[PDB]
């Protein structure tokens, strides 16, 4: 839900205000939380729902990386 | 002479280290002696005029020689030090001439007579009447005007330097942001302002634009540098050129009417001022009490009020410090002698009993100056020129001769040829005027002078 809201705009309902208005749009949040989440998901891999969640998270991360690259290009075009 | 001009023009670009300071010091003595033998002690005014002319000439020469190259070497450093010492010697000579003129003017009216004491309208008449009752406030305001003239002369060609960058339009960014907000509902996502007046943000307690604040700070710096010199014409000129005449319109409330009109044919001169100077200085005292703005407005409010507690860190230089002290003490004395003798029901300046039952004199100034706990003032009160100025102002003899004896015991590690010449000329002028010193110090001065001459 957090990734979906960040990709859309629904951050006010969660508490995050305006994003970091920087020149180069890149990843600024600590990746330690995402790494710990991935480790906790990979700890128990006995069912198919964990693999499905991992695949959905990978697809969402790829889409977010593409959108971030597009935003960085649009910002550098200025 | 075009030789000096071409020499300095070549030296400003050449890559050599030539110090004509020795030649200037060797050539200034015959010209000084010629001026002395041409103008004796009788025509003291013309003598000091020619002296100031020649001194400004050699000061310009030395300052051009100094500025013709970067003063990094020891030779040019000592040349700049000699130039500063020459400026100080000339300002001390100006102070000595002013004090001599004041003493000559007071010698013809040392004795006075009192018979009229009934007050009238307009406190300017009472001030003019009390001016002849005591010479302390007289020399106080004389030193004040002398410091104002010093600041005016030190400002220089700033009025012409301003024209190289004087603006004309203001509040451009604020007007653009307001237009954007009014035409597109965006462009003001911040504590915006309501009106385009200089008092609107300071009244709403919400500022805007740091660049506008910096420009206003620079304009206030310019206004302070123009007012400190004792100028108003150039101040209102810059105000009309830029657009910030509110400061000049506000700095016109502590005046007083000039009640002298007796008919209709006489011009109307009793239109400047207001009788509410009491409440004006009371509001200024409250402002100095709750001061939380910039240093320049804090200092101007301190000078307009007279709170020593906040004036102690406000005083930037020794001249400003002594000016503020003199103004505070003369204002306290005048207001006390006016109120306690007529009416005292509303204290215009919040002065407690410890300040109301205390007659300030002249030695207290030097007392607090020596008691200054600041390290800068403590070091400045122990050099040479500062103590010379203090002794010249105080007209002492015991401490002066004691310090001269200590200087002679130390040796020639502070005085120079020009210093000894100036001291000999000052001693000769004092002996021609009145009183004298001691035979021992006199013959010591003479032998040191002739030794420097033969050297």
């Amino acid at each position: 839900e957090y990734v979906d809201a960040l990709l859309g705009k629904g951050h006010q309902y969660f508490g995050i205000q305006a994003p970091l208005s920087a020149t180069s749009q890149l990843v600024w949040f600590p990746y330690s939380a995402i790494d710990h989440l991935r480790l906790a998901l990979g700890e128990n891999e006995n069912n198919q729902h964990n693999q499905a969640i991992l695949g959905k998270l990978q697809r969402k991360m790829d889409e977010y990386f593409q959108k971030l690259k597009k935003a960085t290009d649009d910002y550098k075009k200025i | 002479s075009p030789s000096f001009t071409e020499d300095i023009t070549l030296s400003a670009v050449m890559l050599q280290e030539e110090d004509p300071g020795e030649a200037a010091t060797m050539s200034m003595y015959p010209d000084f002696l010629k001026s002395f033998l041409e103008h004796p002690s009788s025509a003291v005014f013309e003598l000091i005029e020619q002296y100031e002319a020649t001194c400004n000439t050699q000061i310009t020469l030395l300052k051009k020689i100094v500025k013709r190259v970067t003063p990094g070497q020891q030779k040019f450093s000592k040349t700049a030090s000699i130039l500063w010492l020459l400026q100080q010697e000339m300002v001390t000579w100006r102070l000595i001439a002013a004090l001599y003129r004041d003493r000559i003017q007071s010698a013809l009216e040392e004795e006075n007579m009192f018979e009229i004491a009934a007050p009238n309208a307009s406190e300017k008449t009472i001030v003019d009447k009390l001016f002849q009752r005591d010479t302390l406030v007289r020399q106080s305001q004389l030193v004040v005007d002398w410091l104002e003239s010093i600041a005016k002369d030190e400002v220089g060609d700033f009025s012409d330097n301003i024209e190289y960058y004087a603006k004309s339009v203001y509040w451009e960014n604020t007007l653009h942001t307001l237009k954007q907000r009014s035409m597109l509902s965006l462009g003001s996502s911040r504590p915006l302002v309501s009106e385009l007046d200089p008092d609107a943000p300071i009244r709403q307690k919400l500022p805007l634009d740091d660049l506008d604040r910096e420009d206003d700070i620079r304009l206030l710096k310019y206004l302070f540098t123009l007012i400190r010199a004792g100028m108003t014409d150039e101040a209102q000129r810059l105000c009309k050129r830029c657009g910030q005449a509110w400061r000049a319109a506000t700095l016109e409330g502590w005046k007083l009417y000039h009640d002298a009109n007796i008919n209709g044919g006489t011009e109307l001169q009793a239109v400047e001022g207001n009788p509410y100077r009491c409440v004006w200085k009371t509001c200024c005292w409250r402002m100095a009490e709750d001061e939380q703005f910039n240093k320049y407005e804090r200092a101007i409010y301190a000078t307009l009020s007279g709170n020593l507690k906040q004036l102690l860190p406000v005083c930037e230089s020794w001249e400003d410090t002594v000016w503020a002290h003199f103004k505070v003490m003369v204002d306290s004395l005048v207001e006390q002698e006016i109120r306690a003798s007529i009416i005292s029901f509303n204290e215009a300046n919040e002065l407690p009993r410890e300040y109301l039952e205390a007659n300030w004199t002249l030695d207290s100034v030097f007392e607090e100056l020596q008691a200054t706990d600041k390290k800068r003032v403590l070091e400045e009160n122990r050099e040479h020129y500062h103590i010379i100025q203090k002794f010249v102002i105080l007209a002492d003899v015991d401490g002066l001769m004691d310090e001269f004896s200590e200087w002679l015991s130390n040796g020639k590690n502070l005085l120079l040829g020009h210093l000894l010449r100036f001291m000999t000329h000052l001693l000769l002028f004092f002996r021609t005027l009145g009183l004298q010193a001691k035979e021992e110090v006199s013959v010591e001065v003479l032998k040191t002078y002739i030794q420097r001459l033969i050297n």
């Binding site: 208005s21 920087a22 020149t23 180069s24 | 740091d210 939380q292 860190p313």
Partner: protein, 294 residues
């Protein structure tokens, strides 16, 4: 405790208090006695991960400053062993990064370095209010780090070892992500253009000035994002000549470069899990003596 990652961990000038600023939403300061540790202070008032920290001298006032990922500058003062509120600022273009006070030779002027496009310098005068100096149009992308520079270094002015007191004015350097390095000097009563240089086209991490206590040579070791390092040396009078020379380059992500308290050992930390501790030898060159694991 500190279960999460730990950023910076500084110690008091005497060796009693230990201020460790981490992202665990807790700043714990213990004690140093008999080789043990006892919790004595628990401060917490930030909104994000706390980053850098800087101490001060007790002769000028026990004041601490902490920066976090929230565009907020937090300042505490020590009284009777308890730290309370002092100055709390909030609101910037980006989060604050670097924070440090000027050396004891100048005063207690704090420097705020962040990728905001401008420079906001805080000056502590008197015993109450402070002053703010704003410098705009100085960084296209923004600042990164600010390293102070004392005036007691004989390498900058050749007049110190001659019974002459040098000037005590503010001087430092800056190397933001605007592909330009710059020097700042408090001249003409404010701040303006002093000396700029172009030696990169990306990001620059941090810098380190040499606080030499007896070495008449002023050096600055930089560190960028792509393992780039520049050693600017100076040993002239009045005006210095910064030489953009190179030493031991890298290809990873070099982060911090820190000089010793007396300009003796350089510590470089990046992505190699090795902190090369360099040192000036007696032959006027560099030599590494000890290492450590990360």
């Amino acid at each position: 405790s500190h279960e999460d990652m730990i950023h910076d961990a500084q110690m008091d000038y005497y060796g009693i208090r230990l201020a460790t600023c981490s992202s665990d939403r807790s700043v714990k300061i213990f004690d140093v006695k008999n080789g043990g540790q006892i919790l004595i202070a628990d401060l917490r008032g930030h909104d994000g991960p706390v980053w850098q920290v800087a101490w001060a001298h007790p002769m000028y006032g026990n004041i601490l400053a902490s920066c976090s990922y929230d565009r907020k500058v937090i300042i505490w003062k020590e009284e009777n062993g308890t730290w309370e509120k002092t100055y709390e600022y909030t609101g910037h273009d980006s989060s604050v990064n670097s924070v440090c006070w000027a050396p004891h030779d100048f005063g207690l002027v704090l420097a705020c370095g962040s990728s905001d496009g401008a420079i906001s310098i805080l000056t502590f005068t008197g015993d109450g209010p402070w002053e703010v100096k704003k410098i705009s149009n100085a960084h296209t992308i923004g600042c990164n780090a600010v390293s102070w520079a004392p005036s007691v270094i004989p390498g900058s002015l050749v007049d110190q070892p001659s019974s002459q007191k040098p000037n005590y004015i503010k001087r430092f350097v800056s190397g933001g992500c605007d592909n330009l390095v710059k020097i700042w000097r408090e001249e003409d009563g404010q701040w303006k253009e002093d000396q700029k240089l172009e030696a990169h086209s990306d990001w620059v991490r941090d810098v380190a000035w040499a606080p030499s206590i007896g070495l008449p040579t002023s050096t600055i070791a930089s560190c960028s994002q792509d393992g780039r390092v520049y050693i600017w040396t100076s040993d002239d009078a009045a005006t210095n000549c910064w030489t953009p020379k190179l030493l031991h380059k890298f290809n990873d992500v070099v982060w911090h470069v820190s000089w010793s308290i007396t300009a003796n050992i350089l510590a470089v930390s990046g992505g190699d899990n090795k902190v090369t501790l360099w040192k000036e030898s007696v032959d006027g060159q560099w030599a590494c003596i000890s290492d450590v694991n990360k």
